[PDB]
From a paper:
Cocrystals of 100–200 µm dimension and diverse morphology grew within hours to days in a broad range of conditions. Irrespective of the precipitant or the crystallization pH, all crystals were the same in the trigonal space group H32. The Gly33 carbonyl group is within hydrogen bond distance of four phenols, while Val13 forms CH−π interactions with a single phenolphosphonate. Lys34 is a linchpin residue (115 Å2 buried) entrapped by a phenolphosphonate pair. Structural differences in the interchangeable linkers result in different relative orientations of the protein nodes in the two structures, yielding different crystal symmetries.
Anionic calixarenes are useful mediators of protein assembly. Symmetric and chemically uniform, the macrocycle acts as molecular glue by masking the protein, simplifying the surface features, and providing a homogenous scaffold for controlled oligomerization and crystallization. In this work, we report modular protein – calixarene cocrystallization. Motivated by modular crystal synthesis, we demonstrated the possibility of interchangeable modules in protein – calixarene frameworks by swapping supramolecular synthons.
Residue numbers in the entry: 1 to 90
C-alpha cells in the first residue's frame, strides 16, 4: 500500500537520486546541493532498486523496475534513460 523507494548517491556534495514507486509509476527526485527537483526518469513498476557508479566524473545509474515477475533495467549514462540488457534467470 505504501510507496516504495530506492536511493543512491555519489561524490561529496553529494548528488542524491531517490526513486519512488507509487501506484505503478516510478518517478525520480534529485539533489545536487541546491534543492530537490524532479528528474527525467518515469517508468512503470511496483518495486524499484538502484545502483550507480562513477567513471571519473561521469555518473552511471541502473534502475531495476519490477511488475509481476518481470524486471526491466533502465540505464542512465549521461544522455537519456535507455533500456538495458538485464534479463532474469527466466
Ligand atoms: O540533472 C538531472 C538528471 O539529468 O541527472 C541524471 C539523472 O538522474 C536524470 O534522470 C536527471 O534528470
Ligand atoms: O550500457 C548499458 C549496459 O550494457 O550497461 C551494463 C549493464 O547494465 C547492461 O545490462 C546494460 O545493457
Amino acid at each position: 500500500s505504501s510507496v516504495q523507494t530506492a536511493a543512491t548517491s555519489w561524490g561529496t556534495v553529494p548528488s542524491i537520486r531517490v526513486y519512488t514507486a507509487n501506484n505503478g509509476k516510478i518517478t525520480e527526485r534529485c539533489w545536487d546541493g541546491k534543492g530537490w527537483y524532479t528528474g527525467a526518469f518515469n517508468e512503470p513498476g511496483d518495486n524499484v532498486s538502484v545502483t550507480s557508479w562513477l567513471v571519473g566524473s561521469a555518473i552511471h545509474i541502473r534502475v531495476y523496475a519490477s511488475t509481476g515477475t518481470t524486471t526491466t533495467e533502465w540505464c542512465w549514462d549521461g544522455n537519456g534513460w535507455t533500456k538495458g540488457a538485464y534479463t532474469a534467470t527466466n
